């Protein structure tokens, strides 16, 4: 459950990320596939080579979904129902994998935005990503 401060921190932080969201999304995926190789089994038909255009484009879609979640932080289940359908109903992704990707995104943010990635922002983003993960791994329709 996000506090009012968590919401403000997430919106402020993601705003700082701005147009670089797509790049950070791609790097998060790249870092995840390399650190946790088993996650690659979810993308069998993808070209997962380092610097792949397919991973880069996919990272942008992931980033856009997060931006949408930030904009609807108070009604994420409703805003993300199509992604729940995909990840929970169709892909049956193991929740552990969401912790891995969330972690890699936090690592990516820390590396690129040292000053903005404060402990408070780190805390709020972690909760935000955990909530998004719960929505995407839950079947609630």
């Amino acid at each position: 459950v996000l506090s009012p401060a968590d919401k403000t921190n997430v919106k402020a932080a993601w705003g700082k990320v701005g147009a670089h969201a797509g790049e950070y999304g791609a790097e998060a995926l790249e870092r995840m596939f390399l650190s946790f190789p088993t996650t690659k089994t979810y993308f069998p038909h993808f070209d997962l080579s380092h610097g792949s255009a397919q991973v880069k484009g996919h990272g942008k879609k992931v980033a856009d979904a997060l931006t949408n979640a930030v904009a609807h932080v108070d009604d994420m289940p409703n805003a993300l129902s199509a992604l729940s359908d995909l990840h929970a109903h169709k892909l049956r992704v193991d929740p552990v994998n969401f912790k891995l990707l969330s972690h890699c995104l936090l690592v990516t943010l820390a590396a690129h935005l040292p000053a903005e990635f404060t402990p408070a922002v780190h805390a709020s983003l972690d909760k935000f990503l955990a909530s998004v993960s719960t929505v995407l791994t839950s079947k609630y329709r």
Binding site: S35, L106, V107, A110, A111, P119, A123
Partner: protein
């Protein structure tokens, strides 16, 4: 932990440049702020009611150095983390009853801190090597539960 001769050289080279007076404290501080319940184990540290209170707490910084020192000892003998952390495992598991999941969390927070401090230097390859390292350290601390 199994690291290639190159991963080992890379991990140690990066470690050699770590600010030993701050990194440990930043990781412990972040653990306490990001995963609030961990504060219960450090109530003797006093006020930890806010991000700034935690990060500015001298006891957190001091304790962080101890944690860092343990990681250094781990990196020094990656082939015998079990024996190296034997006594520490007894303390955390049998004495403090710290759940194993928290060891993994501190390991991941440390990874985030290294990324924040080294930036472009903390490449996906560097991270992958460190994930193996922190996973091994966490596993060794949890040996009393095995």
């Amino acid at each position: 932990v199994h690291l290639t001769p190159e991963e080992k050289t890379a991990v140690n080279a990066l470690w050699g440049k770590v600010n030993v007076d701050a990194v440990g404290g930043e990781a412990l501080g972040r653990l306490l702020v990001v995963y609030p319940w961990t504060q219960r184990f450090f109530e003797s540290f006093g006020d930890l009611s806010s991000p700034d209170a935690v990060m500015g707490n001298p006891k957190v910084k001091a304790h962080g150095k101890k944690v860092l020192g343990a990681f250094s000892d781990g990196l020094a003998h990656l082939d015998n983390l079990k024996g190296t952390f034997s006594q520490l495992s007894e303390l955390h598991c049998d004495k403090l009853h710290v759940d194993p999941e928290n060891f993994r969390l501190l390991g991941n927070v440390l990874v985030c801190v290294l990324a924040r401090n080294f930036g472009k230097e903390f490449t996906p390859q560097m991270q992958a090597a460190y994930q193996k390292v922190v996973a091994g350290v966490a596993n060794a601390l949890a040996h009393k539960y095995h």
